[PDB]
Design goal:
five-stranded mixed β-barrel, Replication protein A 70 kDa DNA-binding subunit, about 120 residues, mainly beta, OB fold (Dihydrolipoamide Acetyltransferase, E2P), binds the ligand O=C(O)c1ccc(-c2ccc(C(=S)NCc3ccc(-c4ccnn4-c4ccc(Cl)c(Cl)c4)cc3)c(Cl)c2)o1, about 15% helix, OB-fold, dna binding protein/inhibitor
């Protein structure tokens, strides 16, 4: 409804990246999804997600969630609640968020636009 950005967990991206808050179950919007160059493994999907305030491109789907993308329930513009995730840190210091369980609250067709004007999270 009205006040669309009120549907999203504003501040969750900063909470995840800094505090390392993991007990939260934030509601985020999918902005973009794309497959990763994998080789001969099942595909991996990388997601650009928004909390209304920030976007962050360092999300990856657990392979068990691949059917959500492949059967088109999880697509750009949909709004999801993250129920389980972990943060990992690469050798170079970059952090990545692995989404393990999520729920689609509103399909892409029911939302239809990028909500608000989120800006890229820095670090
Ligand atoms: O069920 C499962 O699939 C499951 C359970 C636990 C895990 C799981 C555990 C650890 C990892 C990690 S950080 N692998 C490191 C990894 C690092 C880079 C990559 C990777 C390959 C191409 N791009 N790219 C990349 C680079 C930068 C960022 Cl910010 C992102 Cl989001 C992706 C691919 C993998 C990943 Cl990807 C998944 O997966």
């Amino acid at each position: 409804g009205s006040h669309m950005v009120g549907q999203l967990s504003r501040g969750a991206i900063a909470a995840i990246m800094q505090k390392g808050d993991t007990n939260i179950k934030p509601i985020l919007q999918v902005i973009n999804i794309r497959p990763i160059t994998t080789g001969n493994s099942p595909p991996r999907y990388r997601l650009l997600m928004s909390d209304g305030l920030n976007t962050l491109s360092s999300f990856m789907l657990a392979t068990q969630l691949n059917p959500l993308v492949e059967e088109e329930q999880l697509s750009s513009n949909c709004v999801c609640q993250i129920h389980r995730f972990i943060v990992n840190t690469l050798k170079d210091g970059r952090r990545v968020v692995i989404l393990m369980e999520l729920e689609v609250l509103k399909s892409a067709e029911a939302v239809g636009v990028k909500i608000g004007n989120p800006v890229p999270y820095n670090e």
